[PDB]
Design an enzyme around this catalytic site. Structure first.
Site, mmCIF file in Angstrom:
data_model
loop_
_atom_site.group_PDB
_atom_site.id
_atom_site.type_symbol
_atom_site.label_atom_id
_atom_site.label_comp_id
_atom_site.label_asym_id
_atom_site.label_seq_id
_atom_site.Cartn_x
_atom_site.Cartn_y
_atom_site.Cartn_z
ATOM 1 N N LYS A 18 44.551 44.751 39.094
ATOM 2 C CA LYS A 18 43.877 45.821 39.820
ATOM 3 C C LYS A 18 43.737 45.411 41.276
ATOM 4 C CE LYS A 18 41.984 49.917 40.167
ATOM 5 N NZ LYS A 18 42.492 50.061 41.588
ATOM 6 N N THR A 19 44.078 46.346 42.184
ATOM 7 C CA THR A 19 43.841 46.180 43.617
ATOM 8 C C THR A 19 42.520 46.836 44.001
ATOM 9 O OG1 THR A 19 44.987 48.247 44.078
ATOM 10 C CG2 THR A 19 46.292 46.228 44.125
ATOM 11 N N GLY A 20 41.960 46.405 45.123
ATOM 12 C CA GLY A 20 40.822 47.166 45.598
ATOM 13 C C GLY A 20 40.467 46.832 47.026
ATOM 14 N N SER A 21 39.971 47.822 47.777
ATOM 15 C CA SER A 21 39.627 47.589 49.161
ATOM 16 C C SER A 21 38.411 48.411 49.505
ATOM 17 C CB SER A 21 40.761 47.983 50.117
ATOM 18 O OG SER A 21 41.986 47.375 49.722
ATOM 19 N N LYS A 51 36.461 49.170 39.464
ATOM 20 C CA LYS A 51 36.851 50.044 38.364
ATOM 21 C C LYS A 51 37.183 49.282 37.086
ATOM 22 C CE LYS A 51 38.664 53.821 41.196
ATOM 23 N NZ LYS A 51 38.604 53.239 42.546
ATOM 24 N N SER A 101 37.939 48.857 44.900
ATOM 25 C CA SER A 101 38.356 49.461 43.637
ATOM 26 C C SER A 101 38.538 48.490 42.480
ATOM 27 C CB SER A 101 39.675 50.244 43.833
ATOM 28 O OG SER A 101 39.378 51.500 44.434
ATOM 29 N N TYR A 107 45.293 59.145 41.388
ATOM 30 C CA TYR A 107 44.210 58.173 41.522
ATOM 31 C C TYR A 107 43.070 58.790 42.312
ATOM 32 C CZ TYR A 107 42.126 53.540 42.358
ATOM 33 O OH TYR A 107 41.302 52.448 42.440
ATOM 34 N N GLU A 158 45.215 48.317 35.065
ATOM 35 C CA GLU A 158 46.590 48.805 34.984
ATOM 36 C C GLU A 158 47.495 47.675 34.491
ATOM 37 O OE1 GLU A 158 47.370 50.358 38.861
ATOM 38 O OE2 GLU A 158 45.486 51.539 38.906
HETATM 39 C C1 LIG Z 1 39.716 51.369 45.744
HETATM 40 O O1 LIG Z 1 39.916 50.418 46.425
HETATM 41 C C2 LIG Z 1 39.807 52.741 46.339
HETATM 42 N N1 LIG Z 1 39.619 52.575 47.737
HETATM 43 C C3 LIG Z 1 38.638 53.439 48.368
HETATM 44 O O2 LIG Z 1 38.028 54.237 47.742
HETATM 45 C C4 LIG Z 1 38.413 53.287 49.872
HETATM 46 N N2 LIG Z 1 39.350 53.453 50.680
HETATM 47 O O3 LIG Z 1 40.648 53.782 50.259
HETATM 48 C C5 LIG Z 1 41.376 54.113 51.406
HETATM 49 C C6 LIG Z 1 40.543 55.060 52.267
HETATM 50 C C7 LIG Z 1 42.686 54.792 51.011
HETATM 51 C C8 LIG Z 1 41.647 52.823 52.178
HETATM 52 O O4 LIG Z 1 41.887 52.860 53.414
HETATM 53 O O5 LIG Z 1 41.631 51.716 51.579
HETATM 54 C C9 LIG Z 1 37.034 52.931 50.421
HETATM 55 C C10 LIG Z 1 35.790 52.711 49.731
HETATM 56 S S1 LIG Z 1 34.735 52.385 50.770
HETATM 57 C C11 LIG Z 1 35.430 52.423 52.148
HETATM 58 N N3 LIG Z 1 34.850 52.181 53.456
HETATM 59 N N4 LIG Z 1 36.799 52.746 51.956
HETATM 60 C C12 LIG Z 1 41.307 53.296 46.143
HETATM 61 N N5 LIG Z 1 42.138 52.332 46.853
HETATM 62 C C13 LIG Z 1 43.679 52.708 47.019
HETATM 63 C C14 LIG Z 1 44.713 51.597 46.850
HETATM 64 O O6 LIG Z 1 45.591 51.655 45.948
HETATM 65 O O7 LIG Z 1 44.675 50.612 47.634
HETATM 66 C C15 LIG Z 1 44.149 54.370 47.107
HETATM 67 C C16 LIG Z 1 45.166 54.779 47.838
HETATM 68 C C17 LIG Z 1 43.056 55.333 46.518
HETATM 69 S S2 LIG Z 1 41.495 54.828 46.815
#
Ligand SMILES: *C(=O)[C@@H](NC(=O)/C(=N\OC(C)(C)C(=O)O)c1csc(N)n1)[C@@H]1N=C(C(=O)O)C(=C)CS1
Length: 357
Positions: free
Chosen positions: A312-315, A66, A63, A149, A271
């Site tokens: 921003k966090t992302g996974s 984004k 993420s 979100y 954010e």
């Molecule tokens: C951005 O990182 C978004 N993450 C995702 O869309 C994915 N997974 O999110 C979940 C399923 C909640 C997770 O276990 O990390 C994703 C994309 S591809 C793939 N194999 N999984 C948002 N990330 C968060 C966050 O704040 O960390 C949210 C709870 C909403 S999705």
């Protein structure tokens, strides 16, 4: 000021026990300090192949993608191709349902459409199915009043925002954001010739790369190395050092404040929290809840505030990334890892490192 050796000791003494406790195979860290990037790499990009993380290792940003989407959208606003006040139906007229009449691009960009769901369903793989998906959606709350979100929200924003350009999202991103910023190792699709640099991510000990999905590039699909991500943080922390352009304007629009939830302000992708802020407040302000929460409107949007913690966090399934910077202090950090580990721990780690600067 901290010497290069002292700063390396701070990063190593924090990251080493973190990686051991979390079973993170590899991490790349950039600290932005005194105008300069500082790179620190640890562990393995590919465990089975015994390949180490280097500054050229590509990680899935999840993420954090984004933030690119938000800046590209800001650039499109600055080009006068779109307005956040435009109705969604101006760019997707087939969305004829009454639930879509009052929804704006702003609502898609900032998660306020009224409860668009987190993910595009995996069995939605073409445009006819994606149309049926959005047609069928029933909002829970009026637009502009709640935050949930959602990849389906800003994902659709990114796809619609580029329509006046005539380019697919990937092309527009490369031409309007990556290339001007010389982010030449940042990819929506990793080229065959770059695959040797692509780390594996690890979920429950198993190597995994992100799967294709509709709207993936917009919401979670960018891959980059720690050097390009340091440049990205530097550009967003100090856009005034860039030449005047719609991209510089778009950076400003993406760090503008559109809504407030508690202490967190919603930008375009980015954010923000007012600085100075305690670490616990940042942790409590970076939980993307499963449930809807009300928002406070910032009308008109507030221009970027230098005294901000911007992050921003992302996974993905196999990666966990984090970027944060404080323009008032001109410090920032990039943390790329090939295992997903809790977002509060990313915040705590970053905050402690920045505190030493
Ligand atoms: C951005 O990182 C978004 N993450 C995702 O869309 C994915 N997974 O999110 C979940 C399923 C909640 C997770 O276990 O990390 C994703 C994309 S591809 C793939 N194999 N999984 C948002 N990330 C968060 C966050 O704040 O960390 C949210 C709870 C909403 S999705």
């Amino acid at each position: 000021p901290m010497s290069e050796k002292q700063l390396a000791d701070v990063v190593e003494r924090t990251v080493t026990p973190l990686m051991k406790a979390q079973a993170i195979p590899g991490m790349a860290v950039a600290v932005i300090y005194q105008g300069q990037p500082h790179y620190f790499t640890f562990g393995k990009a590919d465990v089975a192949a015994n390949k180490p993380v280097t500054p050229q290792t590509l990680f899935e940003l999840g993420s954090v993608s984004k933030t690119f989407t938000g800046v590209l959208g800001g650039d499109a606003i600055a080009r006068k191709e779109i307005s956040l006040a435009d109705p969604v139906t101006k760019y997707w007229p087939e969305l004829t349902g009454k639930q879509w009449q009052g929804i704006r691009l702003l609502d898609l960009a900032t998660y306020t459409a009224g409860g668009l769901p987190l993910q595009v369903p995996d069995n939605v793989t073409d445009n006819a199915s994606l149309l049926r998906f959005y047609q069928s959606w029933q909002p829970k709350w009026a637009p502009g009043t709640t935050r949930l979100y959602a990849n389906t929200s800003i994902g659709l924003f990114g796809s619609l925002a580029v329509k006046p350009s005539g380019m697919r999202f990937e092309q527009a991103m490369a031409e309007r954001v990556f290339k001007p910023l010389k982010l030449n190792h940042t990819w929506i699709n990793v080229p065959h010739a770059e695959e040797s640099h692509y780390a594996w991510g690890y979920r429950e000990g198993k190597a995994v790369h992100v799967s294709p999905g509709m709207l993936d590039a917009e919401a979670y699909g960018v891959k980059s190395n720690v050097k390009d991500m340091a440049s990205w943080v530097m550009a967003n922390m100090a856009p005034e050092t860039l030449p005047p352009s719609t991209l510089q304007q778009g950076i400003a629009l993406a760090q503008s404040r559109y809504w407030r939830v508690g202490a967190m302000y919603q930008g375009l992708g980015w954010e923000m929290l007012n600085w100075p802020v305690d670490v616990k407040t940042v942790v409590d302000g970076s939980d993307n809840k499963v449930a809807l929460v009300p928002v406070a409107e910032v009308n008109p949007p507030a221009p970027p505030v230098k005294a901000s913690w911007v992050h921003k966090t992302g996974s993905t399934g196999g990666f966990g990334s984090y970027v944060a910077f404080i323009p008032e202090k001109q410090i920032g950090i990039v943390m790329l890892a090939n295992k997903s580990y809790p977002n509060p721990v990313r915040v705590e780690t970053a905050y402690r490192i920045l505190e030493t600067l």
